[PDB]
């Protein structure tokens, strides 16, 4: 349930929450979203989230 913190633009992604548009369903760690996946918000890479 460990959250992540964009530094680019500081959108959170919630493990609860998913990212269902993206096609990752509630429940889904940070760990296992897809390879190509993107921060929603601004388009930068998962290397650029931090553990929040
Ligand atoms: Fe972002």
Not at 29 to 38: E, H, R, Y
């Amino acid at each position: 349930m460990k959250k992540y913190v964009c530094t680019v633009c500081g959108y959170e992604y919630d493990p609860a929450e998913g990212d269902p548009d993206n096609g990752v369903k509630p429940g889904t760690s940070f760990d296992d979203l897809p390879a190509d996946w993107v921060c929603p918000v601004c388009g930068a890479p998962k290397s650029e989230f931090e553990a929040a």
